[PDB]
Amino acid sequence: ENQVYSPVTGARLVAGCICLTPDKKQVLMITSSAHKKRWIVPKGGVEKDEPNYETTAQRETWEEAGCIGKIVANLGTVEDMRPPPPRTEFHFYELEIENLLDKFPECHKRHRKLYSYTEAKQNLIDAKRPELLEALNRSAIIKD
Ligand SMILES: Nc1ncnc2c1ncn2[C@@H]1O[C@H](COP(=O)(O)OP(=O)(O)NP(=O)(O)O)[C@@H](O)[C@H]1O
Ligand SMILES: Nc1ncnc2c1ncn2[C@@H]1O[C@H](COP(=O)(O)OP(=O)(O)NP(=O)(O)O)[C@@H](O)[C@H]1O
Ligand SMILES: Nc1ncnc2c1ncn2[C@@H]1O[C@H](COP(=O)(O)OP(=O)(O)NP(=O)(O)O)[C@@H](O)[C@H]1O
Numbered sequence: 475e476n477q478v479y480s481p482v483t484g485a486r487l488v489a490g491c492i493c494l495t496p497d498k499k500q501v502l503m504i505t506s507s508a509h510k511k512r513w514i515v516p517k518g519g520v521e522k523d524e525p526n527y528e529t530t531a532q533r534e535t536w537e538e539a540g541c542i543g544k545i546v547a548n549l550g551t552v553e554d555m556r557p558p559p560p561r562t563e564f565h566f567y568e569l570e571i572e573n574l575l576d577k578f579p580e581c582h583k584r585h586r587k588l589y590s591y592t593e594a595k596q597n598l599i600d601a602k603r604p605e606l607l608e609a610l611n612r613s614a615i616i617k618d
C-alpha cells in the first residue's frame with residue numbers, strides 16, 4: 475500500500491496531534507471508526523511521499539477532526555504492544571487549536587468534542603489506549 479514501516483522493527487509509522495485549546499484546559503477528541511463509543515485522538519499512517527511527521531500529523535488532524543492549528547511541541551514517540559516486536563510507532567505533536575471547521579472529510583463517520591484532562595484520561599482508559607494517554611500526559615494540558 476502507501477504505508478511506511480520502521481526499517482528496524484517493521485512497526486507501522488503513525489503520526490498525530492494532541493490538540494489543545496489556547497488556555498490549555500481542554501483536548502480535542504474524536505470517536506474511533508472501529509469502536510464508535512470509544513474516544514481517541516487524531517493520528518494515522520505516514521504515507522510514502524510525506525517529508526516529515528508534522529505533515530502526517532496535521533493531515534490526519536484535518537481529515538479526522540476538522541482541526542487547524544500550529545504545532546508548538548514535539549511529544550516524541552510511543553510504541554503499541556500487540557499482546558498474545560511493536561507493530562506501531564507513534565510520533566505525536568502538541569497543536570494549539572486555531573480553528574474547528576463544521577465540515578471536514580470524516581465529519582459523517584465520527585463525533586468530535588473538547589474534554590478536560592480528567593475526562594480525556596478516563597476516555598483513553600475506557601478505549602484501552604494507554605499509549606495515547608502517555609502522549610496526552612507529555613502535553614502542556616492543565617491536569618488540575
Ligand atoms: N492499541 C492499538 N495500538 C495500535 N494500533 C491499534 C490499536 N488498536 C487498534 N489499532 C489498529 O490501528 C488502526 C486504527 O485503529 P484506531 O486507532 O481505532 O483508529 P480508527 O479511528 O478506527 N481509524 P481507521 O480504522 O484506520 O479508519 C487499525 O488497523 C486498528 O486495528
Ligand atoms: N493492532 C494492534 N496493535 C497493538 N495493540 C492492539 C492492536 N489491536 C488491539 N490492540 C490493543 O490490544 C488490547 C486488546 O484489543 P482488542 O482485542 O481489540 O479488544 P476489544 O476491541 O476491546 N474487544 P473485547 O475486549 O474482547 O470486548 C487493547 O488494549 C487494544 O488497544
Ligand atoms: N518525549 C518524551 N518521551 C519519553 N518520555 C518523556 C518525554 N517527555 C517527557 N518524558 C518523561 O515522562 C515523564 C513526564 O514528562 P514531562 O512532560 O516532562 O513532565 P514531568 O516528568 O512531570 N516534569 P519534569 O520531570 O520536571 O520534566 C518524565 O519521567 C519525563 O522524563
Ligand SMILES: [Cl-]
Nearest residue numbers: 488517518519
Ligand atoms: Cl493509527
Ligand SMILES: [Mg+2]
Nearest residue numbers: 517518519534
Ligand atoms: Mg490515514
Ligand SMILES: [Mg+2]
Nearest residue numbers: 488517518519
Ligand atoms: Mg489509521
